[PDB]
Design goal:
This is part of a larger assembly, with chains A (147 residues), B (107 residues), C (64 residues) and D (99 residues).
Chain A (H helix, E strand, L loop, with lengths): L77 E5 L9 E2 L2 H4 L9 E5 L8 E2 L3 E2 L1 H7 L11
Parallel strand pairs in A: 1-3, 2-4, 3-5
Chain B lengths: L11 E4 L8 E8 L4 E4 L4 E6 L9 E6 L2 E2 L3 E3 L11 E4 L5 E4 L9
Antiparallel strand pairs in B: 1-2, 1-7, 2-3, 3-6, 4-5, 8-9
Chain C lengths: L6 H4 L3 E2 L5 E4 L12 H7 L2 E3 L2 H10 L4
Antiparallel strand pairs in C: 1-2, 2-3
Classes of the chains: A little secondary structure (147), B mainly beta (107), C alpha+beta (64), D alpha/beta (99).
The structure holds five RNA strands.
RNA sequence: AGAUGGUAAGGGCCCACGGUGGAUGCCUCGGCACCCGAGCCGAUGAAGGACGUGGCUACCUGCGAUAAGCCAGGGGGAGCCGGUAGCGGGCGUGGAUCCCUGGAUGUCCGAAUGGGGGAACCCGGCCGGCGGGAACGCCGGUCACCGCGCGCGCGGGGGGAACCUGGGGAACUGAAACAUCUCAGUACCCAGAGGAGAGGAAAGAGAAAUCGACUCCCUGAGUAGCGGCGAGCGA
RNA sequence: CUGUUGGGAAGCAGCGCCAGAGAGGGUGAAAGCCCCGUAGGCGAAAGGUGGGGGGAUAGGUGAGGGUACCCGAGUACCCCGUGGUUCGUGGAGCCAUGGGGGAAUCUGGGCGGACCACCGCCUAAGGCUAAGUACUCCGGGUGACCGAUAGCGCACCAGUACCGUGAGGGAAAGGUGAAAAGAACCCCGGGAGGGGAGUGAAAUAGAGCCUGAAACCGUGGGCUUACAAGCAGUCACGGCCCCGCAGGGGUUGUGGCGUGCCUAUUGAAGCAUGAGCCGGCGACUCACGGUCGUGGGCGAGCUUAAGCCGUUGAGGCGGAGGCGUAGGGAAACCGAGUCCGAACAGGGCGCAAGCGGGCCGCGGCCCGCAAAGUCCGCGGCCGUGGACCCGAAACCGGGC
RNA sequence: GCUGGGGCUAGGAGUGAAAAGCUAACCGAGCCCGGAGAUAGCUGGUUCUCCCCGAAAUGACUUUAGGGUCAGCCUCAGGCG
RNA sequence: GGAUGACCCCAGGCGGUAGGGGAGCGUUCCCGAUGCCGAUGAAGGCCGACCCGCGAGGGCGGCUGGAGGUAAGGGAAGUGC
RNA sequence: ACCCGGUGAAAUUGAACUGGCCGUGAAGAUGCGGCCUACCCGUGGCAGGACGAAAAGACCCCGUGGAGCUUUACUGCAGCC
């Protein structure tokens, strides 16, 4: 395997579409922009703009709390993980040991959740849902609850 | 700050290349600004001169054209062989140029 | 430079779990006497925006 | 790639690991000698990988040799060259890179 | 009866060869970009100039009435008296040209500063010299203004591609109109700083029994919020 | 080094050699070994630097008890007017301060987003402080940078010529050859120019100089043309010239046919736009985000950023962080559910995982294959920037 | 009255026996440089070759009406059959 | 049919602006390159009635030109008037 | 003005091998159709035509273009109270 062999698979590299470069191309003259009018010009935001009529968005009404200065309130937050996700572990499970595993995102208080089979496991968590608690306290799990 | 020249007037040199490949002569003259040398009976050229006081009857005169100094190779007075120059710090202790097979001085 | 989320959207719309765009029914912010309780009751419900326009609003929210 | 680059080459008996480097103590002819004795005549081109400063210095100025400390190994310099030649001591760091 | 050919003033097409012109290729003393290094100069008169300066010298370079140069130290080792040949003359291994360092000289203008002035001109005071030298003129020194100190000292003044801080500070434009908003504390003007500048040892952060100067980068995060809750702005 | 072809060798051939140097460039062409170099190494009396080494000096250092002396004033603080911050008057604090009022010295004061109370934080109204940062006139190094319409405006005596009263505007213009060997002398000519001679490997390389395209102008040759009607061509046949020896090439007499190109348009040969002709320059890009698609990597996971180390076209480390793994709700919250509701109706928005094949006494659970996802490459499109290129009338700032 | 010389007044400003006259050969706001590649829903231009398909000039709304958003119609990929 | 782009047979489609898509050509530059072509002649230029390709183009030959050029396969754009 | 000697511009210019009528065609044809007419090339003259040249119509409308002006349009500011 030398240099002249190194080749990218079919369609791994593909030609650009070069417009405005002669009739046979496609693609020439107008350059796929049709005839006249802004959009053919060099240069309006079509996600929002709608022609001077009141937009689709701006006629919808606002909902709920927008928050005000000095902005967002620090309260604790809870990420759930599902009993099924607890599957790969043996012995004791903490939030710490959940993060460093990529199940529980950092700075999130841990809340065990229902979906899945309770494993007879010591699980240390900031919170348990109902059917999570029952399930565990029935497969012989040990639901330590910290603060 | 000086063009480096391996040759001088008028040590004797070989002509390693060109149309005088092999010819031998004493450097008449060195021209650093041109990096080239004048060597006797080497590079001779037919120069047209116009009728003037000195050269009445005008016609042509011969001259030694310069040779690019790279073309020339000093002969060392010991081997009698053309050689690359080397340098030796005497004791004196000035620097001299010395043969590259013999250690003969080139001055 | 990175897109900015349209706040005007963010503040009156939520993208669902399956990718639909949901908003409040219009039609009850005032002028509400003389409207049936049927009308009012229903206008209290979140609805799903026709697909053509759901897609646009979805591009205003690149970081949801 | 490092992995696959070396793999391919080995799959061609072009890979050759060495314990050490006979009498190479810096000098280029010194390396020649050794390479001859090892089946390395310069009919083939060599990526010579060693942390041995002295061996690299000897191999360096060869046209048919591309030299390299082992932390410098890389697929290109492998693919460029016909024959990969490494230290045990380089062979280790290589396997460590791919662990 | 009848029909058909040559003739070219000139023109047309083609072929050949030229003229014109300067494309194309090749070239590169030049430029661009990034990185690194380096980073102030100035009243001991800068930056930038004027005028001069060569045996013969239009320009350029170098130099300053000692004028392509003067004194010394260091480099260096055969050539040299710039780009320049030539006229016409010289120097160099008792080491020249050339390069580095220091020093000397450095007209007149220029912050310009003795005074004046239309920059490179003009005119003075005081002290010393020159000439026959009183009148005259030339040479040398010296003489602005402001801020500090106790008349005397010390500083300042101007310049610098960007970069920096501060004092001021738009509009086009965007909002598919526009006035709040935007462009933007941007452009620009001004003052100051310097090789950087600003900032800098908590009357801080803000929720952790926490952190521990300032700057700067990644992230936080287009999050929190801000907003004719528009365009958009944005910790 | 030698031969060899050549104007010239470094090409080709023979036999050698150096290499910590085979980066590059020169030499008459294509050179490791001829030249300048290159790897590796050495170097300053003088001046500058000196953030590294050392030396010195300034300066610096405790505990309890008591006293209540001091702890930065037109300040803090409050009100009025503003500015800064994400904060546009907003519930508007905090920081700065033009106006008015105007304290206290630790049982003092400011702050933690109006205010209050707790609980905490910090000590305003004096100042200095390296480094990490920015820039690039200047030096150097390197380019999937340009190569004289390019690249700076300037490769060249260019911020010049020239233009403008001025601020200011601002060009064009590079190449003989290896070497000037720059063409003595003769001949026509007042010169310019040219013919010989001469130099040169080459002189349509001769200085108005490498290559020397096209428009354009001539000369000579072939075919053709003075009863002919035209977007100039095409088809056919014929004649004449040419190359050759069932075929080609050139031309064109006659016959048929036939409304330029572009643009803009319902519609153009159009008497609608643009274009004298030729040459050169000229317009869908890039960055960061986004969304599909796609080639790969890995997959309940995937990926690093800035940095650090290494390299001097070698890569590695760095898990901070981001995206994914759960949703629903304005939110508290709850959670495979959740919101509305009195509901244990009803409804909105969500939730179900692959395909195997086998061992074993029905899946126990392996094992493979595939995939959620994500990371990079690629491409299409979108956002933000001048965003395909060229063009206003105008607005604003500072100068003249 | 005309005139030489020396002076002063300028850009929303000057000057004006008034014409919006003059302010360096075009003044309903000088020139130059800069913001600046202002903006231009307008006009023009958009450069190689072959192959497959192939529209629209409608409707709703629109300080819209020679412009746009969505719908209709074109095309490509995957899936359904 | 064969066994997956290898060709053969048979049938059908193949006007086309906006426009969508697909396959190519050529220009500069990088890897390939301490290589290969090159003075017994590079690039570039002028010819051609010859060869290959549907075509863009690519060869081959002659003249000029006198020092460069740059493959198979890939990569990147100041890419075709 | 014209002729001979000397010096010698210009806007314009798709390319031209550039006749009449009657038709026709984007509705006013040298260029289409049919007839008519007409050997080739100039020199001086005239202005009917080439919708002749020149000036991207000044009138007209269009642009959510611009500018000057006005007011008991809006909103501000200087100024005055």
């Amino acid at each position: 395997m030398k240099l002249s062999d190194l080749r990218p698979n079919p369609g791994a590299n593909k030609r650009r579409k070069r417009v405005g470069r002669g009739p046979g191309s496609g693609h020439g003259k107008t350059a796929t922009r049709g005839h006249k009018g802004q959009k053919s010009r060099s240069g309006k935001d079509p996600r929002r703009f709608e022609g001077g009529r009141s937009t689709t968005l701006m006629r919808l009404p606002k909902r709920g709390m927008q928050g005000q200065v000095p902005g967002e309130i620090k309260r604790p937050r809870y990420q759930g993980v599902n009993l099924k996700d607890l599957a790969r572990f043996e012995g004791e499970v903490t939030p710490e040991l959940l993060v460093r595993a990529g199940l529980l995102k950092k700075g999130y208080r841990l809340k065990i959740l229902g979906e899945g089979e309770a494993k007879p496991l010591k699980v240390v968590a900031h919170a348990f849902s109902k059917s999570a608690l029952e399930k565990l306290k029935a497969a012989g799990g040990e639901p330590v609850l910290l603060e | 700050m000086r063009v480096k020249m391996h040759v001088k007037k008028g040590d004797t040199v070989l002509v390693a290349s060109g149309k005088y490949k092999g010819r031998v002569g004493k450097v008449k003259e060195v021209l650093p600004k041109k990096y080239a040398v004048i060597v006797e009976g080497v590079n001779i050229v037919k120069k047209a001169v116009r009728v003037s006081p000195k050269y009445p009857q005008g016609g042509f005169i011969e001259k030694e054209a310069p040779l690019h100094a790279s073309k020339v190779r000093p002969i060392c007075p010991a081997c009698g062989k053309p050689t690359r120059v080397r340098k030796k710090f005497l004791e004196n202790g000035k620097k001299i140029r010395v043969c590259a097979k013999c250690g003969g001085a080139l001055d | 430079p990175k897109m900015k989320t349209h706040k005007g959207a963010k503040k009156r719309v939520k993208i669902t779990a399956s990718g639909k765009v949901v908003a409040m029914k219009t039609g009850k912010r005032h002028l509400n006497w003389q409207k049936s309780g049927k009308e009012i009751r229903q206008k209290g419900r979140k609805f799903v925006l026709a697909k053509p326009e759901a897609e646009r609003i979805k591009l205003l929210l690149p970081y949801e | 790639g490092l992995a696959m680059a070396v793999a391919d080459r080995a799959r061609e008996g072009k890979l050759l690991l060495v314990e050490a480097f006979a009498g190479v103590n810096g000098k280029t002819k010194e390396f020649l000698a050794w390479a001859k004795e090892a089946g390395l005549d310069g009919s083939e081109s060599v990526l010579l990988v060693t942390g041995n400063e002295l061996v690299r210095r000897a191999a360096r100025n060869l046209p048919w040799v591309v030299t390299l400390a082992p932390e410098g190994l890389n697929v290109y310099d492998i693919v460029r060259t016909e024959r990969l030649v490494m230290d045990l001591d380089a062979w280790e760091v290589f396997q460590n890179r791919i662990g």
